[PDB]
Design an enzyme around this catalytic site. Structure first.
Site, PDB file in Angstrom:
ATOM      1  N   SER G 119       0.855  -1.181   0.000  1.00 33.78           N
ATOM      2  CA  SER G 119       0.000   0.000   0.000  1.00 33.78           C
ATOM      3  C   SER G 119       0.892   1.232   0.000  1.00 33.78           C
ATOM      4  O   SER G 119       1.592   1.501   0.982  1.00 33.78           O
ATOM      5  CB  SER G 119      -0.945   0.018   1.192  1.00 33.78           C
ATOM      6  OG  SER G 119      -1.828   1.121   1.116  1.00 33.78           O
ATOM      7  N   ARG G 120       0.858   1.977  -1.096  1.00 35.99           N
ATOM      8  CA  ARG G 120       1.691   3.151  -1.279  1.00 35.99           C
ATOM      9  C   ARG G 120       1.077   4.404  -0.675  1.00 35.99           C
ATOM     10  O   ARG G 120       1.732   5.451  -0.661  1.00 35.99           O
ATOM     11  CB  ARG G 120       1.948   3.359  -2.777  1.00 35.99           C
ATOM     12  CG  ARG G 120       2.677   2.196  -3.432  1.00 35.99           C
ATOM     13  CD  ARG G 120       2.765   2.322  -4.952  1.00 35.99           C
ATOM     14  NE  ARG G 120       3.661   3.388  -5.389  1.00 35.99           N
ATOM     15  CZ  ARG G 120       4.276   3.422  -6.571  1.00 35.99           C
ATOM     16  NH1 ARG G 120       4.107   2.445  -7.454  1.00 35.99           N
ATOM     17  NH2 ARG G 120       5.069   4.441  -6.870  1.00 35.99           N
ATOM     18  N   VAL G 121      -0.149   4.318  -0.166  1.00 35.04           N
ATOM     19  CA  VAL G 121      -0.874   5.475   0.341  1.00 35.04           C
ATOM     20  C   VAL G 121      -1.275   5.259   1.791  1.00 35.04           C
ATOM     21  O   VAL G 121      -1.079   6.133   2.642  1.00 35.04           O
ATOM     22  CB  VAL G 121      -2.122   5.752  -0.511  1.00 35.04           C
ATOM     23  CG1 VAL G 121      -3.074   6.671   0.227  1.00 35.04           C
ATOM     24  CG2 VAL G 121      -1.740   6.331  -1.859  1.00 35.04           C
TER      25      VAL G 121
END
Ligand SMILES: Nc1ncnc2c1ncn2[C@@H]1O[C@H](COP(=O)(O)OP(=O)(O)OP(=O)(O)O)[C@@H](O)[C@H]1O
Ligand SMILES: [Mg+2]
Lengths: 232, 48, 382, 237, 128, 237, 255
Positions: G119-121
């Site tokens: 998960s980049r966010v």
């Protein structure tokens, strides 16, 4: 040729690489114990050797498990160059193919763990019972020595009421001293061998990773040539 | 036989150790798995 | 007779229960072909396919000279896409062996217009269907259907029909299907006749994922897979016993050969499992080493020369001596000397065993025990 | 060639180089003729346009034609429709491969993919047939062990297989042969080797007579006597 | 170059590089609906290059002893010489000088793979 | 089938053999009708055609049409659009593999590649899910050690994994069953087993109660209450 | 969902599954005779899935600060992510949750591959109570995923790896849970705490499920104030970590 073939080839190669990496690691872990053993045993051997230093058949040692590189090759070769009791199946087979009539005794199953005076003393006992080894005008022990953390060298060592008990005891002492050093050597040569093996696996992966991409591009191009010619 | 004499004397000095002191090493020293077969003709395998 | 006549339906058929004896150990004992069957001979270029079909043709000489019309099998060979000189050599082979008197050759050669290459298989089928419909037995070999597919593709594309996969037309499956399953085994009501089909297919790069192989493998009742890595290893014919299969199975097999092919197949399966470890035989376990030994000896046992088919009376003793372990003591290189020197012995000193295996068709216990005796009485001298 | 075959009755040999270009030239024109293209891009008529030419190159009761055809393989893909179709029209086929050329082994023939109708004991003799079969078996055993040698090494191999690998490396290298027309760009003078000498040499190699001579003695020499001569020369170095 | 050739003078022509001529011809063709062959290239790429490189010829004293020497350049994807255009130009030409990247990074510059490299006329031109 | 459902008020089962050819024929009819071929050569309407067939196979208030569909996987590629599209609809699989008859146990159903969506505690119960999970764990542990059992032997195994392999072989064999229709050819009488008599019978084997018994007692026996008797009758022989 | 997004409300949209949407679009276009591209798909399939997905957004205060959250599903054959539609969607999305069959049929449920999932966010959005305790779970699991290959050998393994092999087993057995049983953060943080702090090491790996189900009841029956504070505040004070250590140890001892 097709994608299902290159991908299965690559998966097989990656499995070989993992199987060799775990082997390298386990050989690295099993070493500390073998080195402790080699040092303790050689520290014992120095004491008994000092007496001969001041004053005045063949046993061939290898394990039964292979995939250790040249441990058995160099030792069978050194024994033939010197030219018998074989500890381990692999030296046994090497000698049995060349000179089947000379083998007198074979011991197997020992190498699975660090050697001990129980195995050495029992081997000495069966040796002096079946062969009466003490009568031979000469006895010699062939074993591998870990000259360095990345190499080894084969070696021969002689075995020449104090004299009776002394010789009978030094027989077990020298058999133990040789088994320990051979065990250390084979672990080290099973750690460098699998290192080379894993790196060769990496090079093969880096080749098949180009072959795969080429086949991927070709497959897409041709599937689309077919679709276009159908759509024309 | 003298080496095996030392072996059985060692076992005597070893089993007489307190049962809390018999570390895994002490048991290992007592579990030789070796088999022997005299020889190209040779009989069945014999335990040590 | 018309070319594209309709195949017989469900009702008039009878199940395949009688053998098309090839005289090849690797087939009769591991992938049996029955009368009424459809067996695809599949393999890469120059792998042995025509040899299989032609040994099958040539082995019928022992029955077709016979008076019992129920055993003799007539042959039809459809050369599609082949050059005329190959047919000249094939007719030479068949003439030498006296097999022409029971063989029809239908030749839509390369120079023949593509329509005739597309049409020849149906006309050859219609030729065999006469023997079927008159209570006789036939074996139709197609060499090969890939080239009929190429001709049909040429025709279709020049007729401006839209192509499908691999540039082939959409209805090539309907081309081959209404060709192959005209083969049938008819019931007594319709004259007991049979037509047996052996379609050849040529696999580029060993890829069975190609369109025409994918189709024909789906139409046929079994496949004899020929592979070149086996050829160069001296396993000839190069039949991959693991990829090859029959869906008719034991029903098509000679009973005596069945009684041993069961164990033969089990042991070769065990070998196929362990074979990855074949080279490092020494360090393996006892049971794995034994399985490797027996499987290698059997694989060597299955080889035989070209144009040298065997009778089942000569196959049974050999597969018996292999299965039941007698050959384990014989070095892998001497097995060729074995099957030659053993049969010559059996024919000389134990003829009644061969005579009864042939006549009775089944291995009786009184006979199986004498066969064990007669094999021990040989491995001892050998 | 056909006039020489039929009208003169003489014996004829016909060299065609390169016959793939005929099919390629047909392919180039097919699209402009107004035909739907077939597989990887060739014309529909490939198999029959080829046959109409190829079936004229043949021996007849009136005369003999011996035909040597060069067949280009594009992208080294032996499965390209053109070669795949040509293979069926030839009695003998020698497949030159690039790998054997990178290894330095000219004339680069793949000892296994090369095949001939005449390699049967009824014609070449049983000695010759068995020698060729043993050569093929040795080389295929060598090619089946290549992964093992790449990753594991030669130590793991058995005693028979180490010998078979040494002998395969000798054999594949002894199939090299210098050509008198290639001397200008290879330097090595040419060698012509008789059939009987070749069979005898490969027999002697298979039978183990020369396990004591190194691999380099076999490279780009002729017969076995030249292997011995070069072994002596290298030893004297 | 053919002017120097045809008037008795010696010329050398470097093409850098024919892979991109091939790409441009693929473009020109596919935009004309010319059916794609292998590697999506048109069937007449061999004819694109052969009639270009055959013009490199050494002439006789009947014509005037001119010569045109062609050094075509090819870029190989991933170092593979088995591609379509490379193989075609290898078939046309009289040799190849294969420059290998492994040697270049090692500091072997020029990176001549003497193994794959060959001049099939060879010693005839070399200085005595 | 739908008539017997909706107009006979009873549960029926529909065999389709083989479902691959539905899609094959759809591809033929699409190509013939001039529709642009999709991926490897199937019709664009593949998913919708399969849907319009399958989604009639469902339960309704009047009954259920059940279906057992043979699925031909070309070239053993489960990623081919035909089986890939079929899999989206079916929720139970039954793999009959040659690799199980090669070692002589019938029905010859692979206990590990065969799988079901309904193997959920909310459907079969937790008592059944536990047994099934531990079966798929023992068999998989055995299928993990085979290389080790071959190169080494069964002595090297730990006493734990030796017991696991014993119970795995016993389970592998006990999954065999004589069909009530095989009475003619095999001769064996044939029997059927309820889900309780099976779940509990395997629970008893995993719990080690019948570890005293040899493997052969499990081979063609419909339930443990008869494995005991076979053991007795074999020991008495 | 955009109605909720635009009216200041929060919406979640689960597409199960978009591969079949791409197939529908391929059919629709090929029957319209539009020129196909790769994999028989039309050219602009990327413009189909992007135009669908990146309508998901979190809005500014000027717009009511609503949101719409997208969980697209993609069925990968043989687990290959090299395919066209999976590549496109992997490139469009802000992360991926990778479910692997290899872990599923070994009884792990959910079969989330922690190594490939990213998960980049959300790491900025994560709940603080969970972040504080689970920061190290990535590392412990990444080390377990290496040592897993060496595990079956036994005593030969070093103690600094035996500790890893002891922890990661309990952690993997913790992260698995039965379906239709979603747990509150107040019940999740104590368990990840007991695990990362190694308190479960004294428990047989076969009984972790008995542990969790018991532990929840104890904190709920004898330490509810702490769960209440965890969810009222969302973050662990200096003091709450201490009370959690005390409760966890007093339980594990008497468990
Ligand atoms: N059992 C065998 N023993 C020895 N050689 C064999 C055997 N079977 C085939 N061969 C050889 O293999 C070669 C190929 O024979 P065959 O005609 O069967 O190949 P094919 O499958 O028809 O290939 P193609 O038709 O594409 O040429 C022949 O030269 C033959 O001598
Ligand atoms: Mg043929």
């Amino acid at each position: 040729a097709t994608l299902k073939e290159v991908e299965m080839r690559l998966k097989s190669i990656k499995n070989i690489e993992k199987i060799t990496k775990t082997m390298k690691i386990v050989a690295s872990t099993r070493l500390s114990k073998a080195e402790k053993a080699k040092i303790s045993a050689k520290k014992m051997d120095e004491a008994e050797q000092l007496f001969y230093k001041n004053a005045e058949l063949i046993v061939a040692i290898t394990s039964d498990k292979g995939l250790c590189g040249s441990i058995h090759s160099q030792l069978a070769k050194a024994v033939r160059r010197h030219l018998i009791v074989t500890i381990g199946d692999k030296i046994k087979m090497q000698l049995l193919r060349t000179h089947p009539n000379n083998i007198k005794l074979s011991i197997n199953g020992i190498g699975k763990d660090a050697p001990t005076f129980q195995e050495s003393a029992l081997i000495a006992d069966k040796l002096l019972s079946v062969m009466k080894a003490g009568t031979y005008p000469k006895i010699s022990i062939f074993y591998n020595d870990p000259v360095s953390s990345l190499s080894f060298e084969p070696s021969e060592k002689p075995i020449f009421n104090v004299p009776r008990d002394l010789f009978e005891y030094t027989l077990a002492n020298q058999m133990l001293t040789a088994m320990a050093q051979g065990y250390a050597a084979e672990i080290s040569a099973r750690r460098n061998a699998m290192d080379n093996a894993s790196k060769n696996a990496g090079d093969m992966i880096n080749r098949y990773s180009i072959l795969y991409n080429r086949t991927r591009q070709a497959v897409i191009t041709n599937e689309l040539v077919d679709i276009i010619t159908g759509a024309s | 036989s003298y080496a095996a004499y030392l072996n059985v004397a060692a076992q005597a000095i070893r089993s007489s150790l307190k049962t809390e002191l018999q570390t895994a090493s002490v048991l290992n020293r007592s579990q030789t798995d070796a088999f022997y077969t005299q020889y190209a003709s040779e009989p069945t395998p014999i335990t040590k | 007779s018309r070319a594209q006549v309709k195949a017989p339906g469900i009702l008039p058929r009878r199940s395949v229960h009688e053998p098309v004896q090839t005289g090849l150990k690797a087939v009769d004992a591991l992938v049996p072909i029955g009368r009424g069957q459809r067996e695809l001979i599949i393999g890469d270029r120059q792998t042995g396919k025509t040899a299989v079909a032609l040994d099958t043709i040539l082995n019928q000489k022992r029955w077709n000279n016979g008076s019992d019309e129920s055993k003799k099998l007539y042959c039809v060979y459809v050369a599609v896409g082949q050059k005329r000189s190959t047919v000249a050599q094939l007719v030479q082979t068949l003439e030498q062996h006296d097999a022409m008197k029971y063989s029809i050759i239908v030749a839509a050669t390369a120079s023949e217009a593509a329509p005739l290459q597309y049409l020849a298989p149906f006309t050859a089928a219609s030729i065999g269907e006469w023997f079927r419909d008159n209570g006789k037995h036939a074996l139709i070999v197609y060499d090969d259907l890939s080239k009929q597919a190429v001709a049909y593709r040429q025709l279709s594309l020049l007729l401006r029909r839209p192509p499908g996969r691999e540039a082939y037309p959409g209805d090539v499956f309907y081309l081959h299907s209404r060709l192959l399953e005209r083969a049938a085994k008819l019931s007594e009501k319709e004259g007991s006749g049979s037509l047996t089909a052996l379609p050849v297919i040529e696999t580029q790069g060993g890829d069975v994922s190609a369109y025409i192989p994918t189709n024909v493998i789906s139409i046929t009742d079994g496949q004899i897979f020929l592979e070149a890595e086996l050829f160069y290893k001296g396993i000839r014919p190069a039949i991959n016993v693991g990829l090859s299969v029959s869906r008719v199975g034991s029903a098509a097999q000679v009973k005596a050969l069945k009684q041993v092919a069961g164990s033969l197949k089990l042991f070769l399966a065990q070998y196929r499992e362990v074979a990855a470890f074949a080279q490092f035989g020494s360090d393996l376990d006892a049971s794995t080493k034994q399985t490797l030994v027996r499987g290698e000896r059997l694989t060597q046992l299955l080889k035989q020369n070209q144009y040298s088919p065997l009778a089942t009376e000569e196959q049974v003793p050999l597969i018996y001596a292999g299965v039941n372990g007698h050959l384990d003591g014989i070095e892998l290189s001497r097995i060729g000397e074995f099957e030659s020197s053993f049969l010559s012995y059996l024919k000389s000193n134990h003829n009644e065993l061969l005579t009864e295996i042939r006549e009775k068709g089944e291995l009786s216990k009184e006979l199986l025990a004498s066969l064990k005796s007669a094999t021990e009485s040989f491995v001892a001298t050998f | 060639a056909e006039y020489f075959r039929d009208e003169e009755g003489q014996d004829v040999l016909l060299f065609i180089d390169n016959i793939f270009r005929f099919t390629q030239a047909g392919s180039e024109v097919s699209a402009l003729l107004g035909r739907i293209p077939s597989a990887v891009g060739y014309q529909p008529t490939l198999a029959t346009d080829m046959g109409l030419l190829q079936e004229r190159i043949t021996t007849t009761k009136k005369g003999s034609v011996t035909s040597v055809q060069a067949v280009y393989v594009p992208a080294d893909d032996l499965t390209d429709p053109a070669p795949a179709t040509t293979f069926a029209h030839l009695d003998a086929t020698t497949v030159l491969s690039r790998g054997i050329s990178e290894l330095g082994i000219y004339p680069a023939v793949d000892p296994l993919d090369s095949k001939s109708r005449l390699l049967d004991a009824a014609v070449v003799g049983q000695e010759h047939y068995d020698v060729a079969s043993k050569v093929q078996e040795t080389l295929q055993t060598y090619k089946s062990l290549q992964d093992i040698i790449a990753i594991l090494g030669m130590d793991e191999l058995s005693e028979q297989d180490k010998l078979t690998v040494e002998r395969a490396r000798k054999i594949q290298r002894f199939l090299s042969q210098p050509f008198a027309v290639a001397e200008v760009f290879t330097g090595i003078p040419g060698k012509l080797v008789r059939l009987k000498d070749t069979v005898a040499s490969f027999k002697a190699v298979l039978e183990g007579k020369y396990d004591n001579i190194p691999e380099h003695a076999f490279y780009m020499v002729g017969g076995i006597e030249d292997v011995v001569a070069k072994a002596e020369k290298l030893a004297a170095e």
